[PDB]
């Protein structure tokens, strides 16, 4: 899938973008529907899975019922539909999580659900990126072409999610680790924030929770979480290192499983990894049992 | 292979150990000889490889020519032979490195040399551990049963090799990174130092070299190397983190190859990894291109 960076005054680029989207969305939704159709019967019969399956069918119906975009008037209305659908599907990850939680235990091939979720959630991420990019082309935000930031600062977006995770953590525990950021703190480059907006808060919540739950005697004095930024011509690496006691040997082969948690609902890690790999990067964990965990998020740079 | 921890005043345990060694060594040397016999012809014909092949045949001959140990007198003489052989074989890794350097380019299956070296060097490590353990049983060192230290301090043995690597580094560059050690600095537990004596200096030399070569403008002021110790009931983890600029993407899939170097002779990494895995652990690298590298040495704890 491609995110149009084209620009024009007659607004011709919006028409071209809209037409591309109109061509592309129905095909990709059709693929998601095929995924639901192939789910093991007993899982497909779960009422929450059925609800999500039906949402996708509705999306496909509405998208295919929309006439070919001929002019700006049409394109404007197509954007209304896209906005509606994005909103109607905003809770899909949570619905799948709930729908699958019990039902998946009823089949033996455990690879199956993992594959379905990886494929479904990453396709969905790409679909939402495409659609949101098109809508964003109508915005006049400085330093954005659609959802592409022309000068993203890793430090700034990390700090945004740090503040967010610290507030949640402070609410639950009365305090939160301080976060230090080092390495290429001054880096700025073209980049799409959206995947970071998903991934960063998941990894930060994990690191903070781990830190608090291993320092229950001294909640007022916990070890910092330390984030290192490395920017090179190939990828961006963000290392998130905590002293939260590590991931136990007995849990290590399970933490990347959808639904596994030692506590939200165990999607943070497998989802983040699937997203990173979908975009050409990776998510790798290094556990120092008894000390802490290093998490390495790598995302490939944009090809201008 | 098993390292006898048995003890006795009549010296009966030395006889039992000697007899075990006498049973075990010829079989293991025979396996190494079979490895040389199966090397690709053109490699096996290299005069340095032939020399090493012949050393192993000699070892096998001497070991099999030694009569069955009947008493302390015999056992004492068997130890002389073992000492001689250990000394005669002390440069084997270097000879294999040289012998293989050019010759390996003459075959296409590159997996072949890697497999031969992994198998040969790890078997050799185990053979030397067994033999050195037997000799050591005659020593009266406090806190040792043979080569097994009953209360090893990871911090102490790390500091030993830090001092060693810093001296080499200081000699070549006029300075050396300081090394900080954190985590479980007070840990003490039963452990066999020998593999650490190989591995630690290799990883420290790498980290220090990388650090100096990336700070050629400020040799008098370079970033510390930071070592973290994590001790748990399953394994010992030693993380060696540097700010030496990382391992480049173009080099990453090559650094674990025997002979690959960007400069000694490119054996440090593949050998250390083979040793760690041989003993039930691992050696893993995390490169932050543009910043530095984290190296994780994991070694499984001793089963008492
Ligand atoms: N930084 C960390 N330190 C220790 N444990 C962690 C860390 N990150 C993740 N984990 C473990 O992995 C499990 C799964 O994490 P995740 O998939 O994000 O789901 P959740 O946070 O909802 O449990 C967590 O329950 C926790 O046990
Ligand atoms: N900590 C490190 N930082 C940067 N590069 C490294 C590091 N460790 C190893 N390397 C790279 O890996 C290569 C192979 O290392 P090694 O197998 O120990 O052989 P050698 O040190 O003899 O080159 C080195 O030449 C170097 O390019
Ligand atoms: C555009 C829209 C159908 C989005 C879907 Cl892919 C979803 O978010 O689940
Ligand atoms: C005991 C002796 C033959 C050692 C050999 Cl395995 C070697 O160091 O190469
Ligand atoms: K999980
Ligand atoms: K190498
Ligand atoms: Mg989580
Ligand atoms: Mg080396």
From Swiss-Prot, chains A, B:
Domain (Histidine kinase): residue spans on this chain: 86-303
What is the recorded post-translational modification?
Autophosphorylated.
Q: What is its EC number?
A: 2.7.11.1, 2.7.11.4
Q: Name one GO molecular function term.
A: protein kinase activity
- Where is it located? Mitochondrion matrix; Mitochondrion
Q: Which UniProt keywords apply?
A: Acetylation, ATP-binding, Kinase, Mitochondrion, Nucleotide-binding, Phosphoprotein, Transferase, Transit peptide
Residues annotated as carrying N6-acetyllysine in the record are 119, 160
Residues annotated as binding ATP are: 206, 242, 261-262, 266, 269
Q: What class of enzyme is it?
A: transferase
Q: Which domain of life is it from?
A: Eukaryota
What activity regulation does UniProt give? Answer: The ATP-ase activity is up-regulated by potassium and rubidium ions but not by sodium ions. Up-regulated in the presence of apo- or lipoylated-DBT/E2b subunit of the BCKDH complex.
Its biological function? Answer: Serine/threonine-protein kinase component of macronutrients metabolism. Forms a functional kinase and phosphatase pair with PPM1K, serving as a metabolic regulatory node that coordinates branched-chain amino acids (BCAAs) with glucose and lipid metabolism via two distinct phosphoprotein targets: mitochondrial BCKDHA subunit of the branched-chain alpha-ketoacid dehydrogenase (BCKDH) complex and cytosolic ACLY, a lipogenic enzyme of Krebs cycle.
Q: Which family does it belong to?
A: Belongs to the PDK/BCKDK protein kinase family.
Q: Specify the protein name.
A: Branched-chain alpha-ketoacid dehydrogenase kinase
Report where the shown chain sits in the full-length sequence: first residue, last residue, total length: 74 to 405 of 412
């Amino acid at each position: 899938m491609m995110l149009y960076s084209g620009r024009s005054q007659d607004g011709s680029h919006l028409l071209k973008s809209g037409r591309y989207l109109q061509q592309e969305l129905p095909v990709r939704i059709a693929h998601r529907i095929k995924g639901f159709r192939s789910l093991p019967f007993i899982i497909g019969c779960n009422p929450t899975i059925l609800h999500v399956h039906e949402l996708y069918i509705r999306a496909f119906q509405k998208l295919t019922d929309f006439p070919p975009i001929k002019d700006q008037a049409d394109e404007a209305q197509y954007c209304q539909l896209v906005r509606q659908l994005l909103d109607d599907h905003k809770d899909v990850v949570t619905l799948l999580a709930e729908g699958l939680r019990e039902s998946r235990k009823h089949i033996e091939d455990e690879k199956l659900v993992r594959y379905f979720l990886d494929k479904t959630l990453t396709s969905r991420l790409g679909i939402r990126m495409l659609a949101t990019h098109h809508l964003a082309l109508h915005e006049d935000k400085p330093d954005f072409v659609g959802i592409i930031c022309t000068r993203l600062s890793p430090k700034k977006i990390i700090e945004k999610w740090v503040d967010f995770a610290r507030r949640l953590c402070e609410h639950k525990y009365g305090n939160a680790p301080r976060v230090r950021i080092n390495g290429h703190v001054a880096a700025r480059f073209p980049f799409i924030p959206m995947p970071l907006d998903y991934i960063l808060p998941e990894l930060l919540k994990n690191a903070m929770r781990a830190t608090m739950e291993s320092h229950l005697d001294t909640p007022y004095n916990v070890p910092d979480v330390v984030i290192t930024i490395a920017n090179n011509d190939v990828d961006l690496i963000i290392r998130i290192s905590d002293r939260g006691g590590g991931i136990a040997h007995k849990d290590l082969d399970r933490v990347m499983d959808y639904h596994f948690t030692t506590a939200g609902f165990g999607f943070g890690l497998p989802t983040s990894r699937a997203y990173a790999e979908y975009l050409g990067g990776s998510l790798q964990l290094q556990s120092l049992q008894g000390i802490g965990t290093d998490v390495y998020l790598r995302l490939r740079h944009i090809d201008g």
